[PDB]
Swiss-Prot record:
Chain intervals annotated as zinc finger (C2H3-type): 24-42
Function: Specifically represses the virC and virD operons in the virulence region of the Ti plasmid.
Gene Ontology terms for molecular function: DNA binding; zinc ion binding
Keywords from the named record: DNA-binding, Metal-binding, Repressor, Transcription, Transcription regulation, Zinc, Zinc-finger
Record protein name field: Transcriptional regulatory protein ros
Source species of the chain: Rhizobium radiobacter
Gene giving rise to this polypeptide: ros
Family affiliation: Belongs to the ros/MucR family.
Keyword Zinc: yes
One Gene Ontology biological process: regulation of DNA-templated transcription
């Protein structure tokens, strides 16, 4: 790939939203959910990560309309319950 002081700038924000695919800032690759990929590879929380790229309005890391583009309203970054309650 590269990763020698440059990384992959997936352009500026605003157009980070594409056709049901969200572009991986620092990485280049595209997917439906950066939330996972983020905490997997780049690791850390989506809100903490937006700080790195100075990403305005705390730009969502999940699909453009996944859940009202706003974590389904409330339920902050992290995990609700550490349990798979109900099937």
């Amino acid at each position: 790939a590269v990763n020698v002081e440059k990384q992959k700038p997936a352009v500026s924000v605003r157009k980070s939203v594409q056709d049901d695919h969200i572009v991986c800032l620092e990485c280049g690759g595209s997917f439906k959910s950066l939330k996972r990929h983020l905490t997997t590879h780049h690791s850390m929380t989506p809100e903490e990560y937006r700080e790195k790229w100075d990403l305005p309005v705390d730009y969502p890391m999940v699909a453009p309309a996944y859940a009202e583009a706003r974590s389904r309203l409330a339920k902050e970054m992290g995990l609700g319950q550490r349990r798979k309650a109900n099937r």
